[PDB]
Design a protein around this ligand. Structure first.
Ligand SMILES: C[C@@H]1C[C@H]1CNC(=O)[C@@H]1C[C@H]1[C@]12COC[C@H]1CSC(N)=N2
Length: 389
């Protein structure tokens, strides 16, 4: 019910990532690590880089083991090379356990580390199927569960501030909670609703309906999950398949049409600013994603506000204006429920029961008139048909 040792153990923000403190090696080396539900490698900076203030020094760890194998990891935007090994790993604000885990020691990288992000490595929390270089490299959470009595479950509360944080404020500020092995009831309101994990690779789910201000987007539900839909704390935006993105943007523009925004805003590139305190939240629609439920022919919905999908940013000029970027963008690799949508919800990664739970976050940003919601049930037929093959 209560996991006080782990509450408030995250820092960061949607634009640069949420991270947890970890230690690696003997004696322990402290590093800040991105929480990434959309990948499956534990990978840490292990050599000097301009954007790293510290890195893993394998030669100073008595418990370091060399696996004598390189890994080359190219992403769409960014890449790194590293060397595989194992070492003892702990999470200080975590379960009181130490485990031996695989670590990819990053020795070279391009456009991977983010200037000012305050993290030095990534904790891939998804499944072995998508680990690099192959599925034989046991992910961290798998090791944790196998080596300890920690329950096979974790839960994430990512806390968006609702305003920009300077790098001073972002260091001093609590960014949320990763509860390892449990569900903390203080982090949510109302009921938890669960959707099945379709397959254990990414945290893949099935979206069965989409509404903008209650209006059905009315696409074939396969389009919403083309070629998959995942829950991904290591992606900033809500990302939608091209066709869904075009339909959603058209509907959001129509709902918000009392104000005209430039193409660059809708493309997620350009900020828009309002006089301090005057952001017209009410002109922007709510977005509801309906997810397959655990009961046959049953769905539920999660509803987010513009306070979720408009990401606060600092003005390019010097001002007291309230400024934002549109944090919904197109994808060619399926739907990605990124950090901006996770900030609305307490999300339970129930690996043991192959399901993901959603509840309204106790730290979601809202106004006096509307809140994020998790509601059900709804009768929905032929939901397995919504899955892309
Ligand atoms: C939210 C935060 C600001 C973003 C930066 N994200 C990353 O650097 C994530 C670790 C890197 C990766 C690792 O595999 C693919 C790559 C992109 S998508 C994903 N979930 N993880």
């Amino acid at each position: 019910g209560s996991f006080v040792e782990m509450v408030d153990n995250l820092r960061g923000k949607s634009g640069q990532g949420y991270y947890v403190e970890m230690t690696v090696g003997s004696p322990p080396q402290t590093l800040n690590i991105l929480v990434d539900t959309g990948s499956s490698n534990f990978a840490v900076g292990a050599a000097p880089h301009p954007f790293l203030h510290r890195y893993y020094q394998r030669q100073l760890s008595s418990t370091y083991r060399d696996l004598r194998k390189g890994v080359y990891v190219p992403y769409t935007q960014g890449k790194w090379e590293g060397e595989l090994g194992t070492d003892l790993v702990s999470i200080p604000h975590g379960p009181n356990v130490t485990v031996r885990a695989n670590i990819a020691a990053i020795t070279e990288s391009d456009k991977f580390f983010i200037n000012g992000s305050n993290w030095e490595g990534i904790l891939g929390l998804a499944y072995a199927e998508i680990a690099r270089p192959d599925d034989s490299l046991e992910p961290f959470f798998d090791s944790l569960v196998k080596q300890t009595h920690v329950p096979n479950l974790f839960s994430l509360q990512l806390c968006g501030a609702g305003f920009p944080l300077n790098q001073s404020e972002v260091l001093a500020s609590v960014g949320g909670s990763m509860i390892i092995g449990g569900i903390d009831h203080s982090l949510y309101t109302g009921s938890l609703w669960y959707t099945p994990i379709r397959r254990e690779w990414y945290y893949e789910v099935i979206i069965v309906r989409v509404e903008i201000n209650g209006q059905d987007l009315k696409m074939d539900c396969k389009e919403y999950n083309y070629d998959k839909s995942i829950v991904d704390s290591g992606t900033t935006n809500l990302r939608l398949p091209k066709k869904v993105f075009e339909a959603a943007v058209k509907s959001i523009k129509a709902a918000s049409s009392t104000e005209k925004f430039p193409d660059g805003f809708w493309l997620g590139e350009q900020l828009v600013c309002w006089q301090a305190g005057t952001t017209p939240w009410n002109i922007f629609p709510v977005i509801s994603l309906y997810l397959m439920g655990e009961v046959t022919n049953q769905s539920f919905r999660i509803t987010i506000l513009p306070q979720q999908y408009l990401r606060p940013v600092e003005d390019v000029a010097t001002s007291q204006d309230d400024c934002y970027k549109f944090a919904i963008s197109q994808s060619s690799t399926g739907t990605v429920m990124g950090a901006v949508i996770m900030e609305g919800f307490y999300v339970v990664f129930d690996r043991a029961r192959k399901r993901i739970g959603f509840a309204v976050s106790a730290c979601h940003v809202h106004d006096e008139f509307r809140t994020a919601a998790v509601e059900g049930p709804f009768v929905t037929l032929d939901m397995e048909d919504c899955g892309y093959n």
